[PDB]
Structure formats: structure tokens, C-alpha cells
Amino acid sequence: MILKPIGVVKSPFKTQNDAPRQGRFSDAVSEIAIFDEYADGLHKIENLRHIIVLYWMDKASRDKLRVVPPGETEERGVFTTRSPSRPNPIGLCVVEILEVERNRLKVRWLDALDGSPVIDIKKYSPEIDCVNQ
């Protein structure tokens, strides 16, 4: 299983120390530049307000299985958290499209470090992404 990057992220977060814990609590604007060879996968995306972005957290550790979430004292499995470190550092964010510039998207709520590779983008859908509780 080999992932082929379909784009790259451009944001104001250069290092792990600059990006927000969770993009939903930040007003920072990020850019998703999809590669020309995949650009055609954006057809009619301007009809969407919210999308799901999967990116690769390249500087994250891939052999860490236990972590202490911020504010916590004891460790827990990474699969029970949103920590960047995990066997497959896939960053998952629900973002809001603010603009569509050809093969580039201006969005907010994305918390990827500048330069992070983009893996996939899907339609955000309340009925399947949200749990009524």
C-alpha cells in the first residue's frame, strides 16, 4: 500500500510548535494545492462548503503507540486519541472551503504544517460523519 500525494498544503504553521492542537479552534487560513494530474477530481467542489481532508503528518513518529494527550497525566493508546504519532500518521480534518482558485483551495480548520502532503479529500456529510448524541 503506497499513497500517492494528490497535493500539498501551504499554511502559516511551519513547526509543530506553531500549529493549533485542533484546526477547528483556529481562524488561520490554509491552502490546499492539488496537483494538475489530480485536479480533475475537484470538479464541482465549489458546490461544497465543507469537505474532509486527509493529509500526511510527515514529521510525526510512526513507532509510538502510547501517548499523553495535552492536559492529561497518564498515557493511553494512540488509537483512542487524535495524536499525530501513530503507525500511519494520517491527519484528518473537516475544513470549510472559503475559496476555490483553480486547483487550489483556501480553507480554515485545517491544522497541517506548511508543506504537508495531501492524501485525499471527501465530501463532508452530517448523517455519516456526525453521531447524534
Ligand X SMILES: C[S@@+](CC[C@H](N)C(=O)[O-])C[C@H]1O[C@@H](n2cnc3c(N)ncnc32)[C@H](O)[C@@H]1O
* Binding footprint of ligand X on the chain (CB under 6 A): 16, 19-22, 57-60, 82, 84, 91-93, 111-113, 116, 122
Q: Phi/psi at 74 (nearest 5 deg)?
A: -110, 155
Query: Using the rule CB under 8 A, is 120 a contact of a copy of itself?
Result: yes
Instruction: Give dist(CA 70, CA 83) in Å, integer.
Output: 9
Instruction: Give dist(CA 15, CA 34) in Å, integer.
Output: 22
Q: Which residues, 6 or more positions from 26, have their beta carbon under 8 angstroms from its beta carbon? A: 20, 108, 109, 111
Query: Using the rule CB under 8 A, is 80 a contact of a copy of itself?
Result: yes
Binding partner of residue 112 among ligand X, a copy of itself, none, CB cut-off 5 to 8 Å per kind: ligand X
58 is in an annotated binding site: yes
Minimum CB distance to a copy of itself smaller for 14 or for 123? 123
State the binding site.
Answer: 16, 20-22, 58-59, 82, 92, 113-116
